[PDB]
Symmetry: C3
Subunit: 198 residues, 3 copies
């Protein structure tokens, strides 16, 4: 019944799960507070190496701290996009280090004025991950695109079958946990994002 | 006989047409003045929501205000690239918000020194829409690439058949006109381009 | 027996060849000094228009002046990636203007702390050529990807057969040498990289 579930694997992956499936995990203060507390806990636990972020049920996070605070963590966040990824849900996914998506999962850059203007929000991350052209197209049209188009556009690293989504996100996450030390991951995130988050 | 034609649809799309087909709409002072006046008119008319830009005949704009002034408009410009898009014609296309191209249409980043050095010109927009690598390749080689390669490289949103070019550009344009308010479009353009145009 | 071989074609291409095949051309002070001296020589010779960079044997440069000094040359460098491109070898390839790769050639962004933190190194060039997402994935995973994936990701202009690698890199290089004047190439490199190398 908690808004956000928290689970740690033996391999040192914190699994963070949006748990309001009845509303396709639409953003809200319960979901926010669960998310922050869950992230803080993974971030503070030296036994945790990598974070996996996902939504329970049919949707990832469909509509409704700075927007990009995930980019300033010492630890990587892997989004496993199980279904509808819309509005603030797209913004949060794109703030993550790496994204896997289930085949058929729907994306839409649909926003109210407040999301469009928000500093370090979608109008910041989207063109940085893709380009002005992609960002203009997706924002002005508000159109729906699927996991496969998202991958073509570079919004997603890899599309897998729905059944294989979590095994793959977890495989990859323990893979990087073995390959990089904790201070190497922190260095990488800080080096890649750079001066740009400040 | 006007250098640039102007037409407004019932749906609030201003269609701006380069009308010097005999010279494949090669840039010139007549074409410039028509273009500025036509853009100003669409921009000033509160009945106009979106602008569509195209060339009459076999070519879009093949060879020969700041270069990027289209990026600072309150309203989106959709380029419908019907044929040869070269030199300053490529620069103008790339300054537009969204590009559709006819199958087979030729592109070339061929420039004199003046176009290469021009501030906020092709050496600004090209790598921003693609990358240093793409920009270096296209500029140093001056090579010809077709609509399909342009799409792969992210220079074009979508390739359609020549017959379907204008219907598609207009469909998309009235689509965004319904989806976004005028102040939402203005906000989007300002948020996406950001500090970078100043 | 020289660490780096130097050869000039009639067409004004300087061919620079890493010549420590026994260790897959792994970076080292011999290789560095040969490379700098060879580049300086091409750069100073007004008969030289374009530089081609390659590795003798099975590998390009597999593991181990500022990192990006190639980007500040007046003349283009075309990398012909014949085989394993890893660590500092990936950084050097990516500093080049244009990259061709042999089919099957292995790439890996595998680095010690010193390479990850290095200023204007891989954590600078990689996301600029691709994106934060690609850079985060490749750096945090340290994974191996082949020429074909590298091309999809925009790290490579074109994959050719191993037999056709040098003929193609040289064709392209003499092609650009005919198309651009020397001062036009210098202008292009300076315009594309811009304020960013300073
Ligand atoms: Cl490491
Ligand atoms: Cl809106
Ligand atoms: Cl030229
Ligand atoms: K350590
Ligand atoms: K309004
Ligand atoms: K000259």
């Amino acid at each position: 019944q908690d808004a956000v579930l928290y689970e740690a694997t033996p391999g040192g992956v914190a699994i963070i799960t949006f748990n309001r499936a009845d509303r396709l995990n639409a953003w809200g203060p319960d979901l926010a507070a669960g998310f922050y507390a869950a992230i803080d806990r993974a971030e503070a636990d030296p036994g945790i190496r990598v974070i996996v972020l996902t939504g329970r049920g049919r949707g990832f996070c469909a509509g409704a701290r700075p927007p990009h605070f995930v980019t300033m963590l010492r630890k990587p966040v892997i989004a496993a996009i199980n279904g509808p990824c819309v509005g603030i849900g797209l913004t949060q996914a794109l703030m993550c280090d790496v994204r896997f998506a289930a085949a058929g999962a729907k994306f839409a850059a649909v926003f109210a004025r407040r999301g469009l203007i928000a500093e370090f929000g979608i109008s910041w991350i989207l063109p940085r991950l893709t380009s002005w052209a992609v960002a203009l197209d997706l924002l002005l049209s508000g159109r729906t695109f699927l996991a496969e188009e998202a991958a073509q556009l570079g919004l997603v690293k890899e599309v897998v079958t729905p059944e294989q989504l979590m095994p793959r996100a977890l495989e990859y996450a323990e893979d990087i946990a073995r390959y990089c030390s904790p201070s190497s991951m922190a260095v990488i995130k800080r080096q890649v994002y750079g001066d740009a988050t400040r």
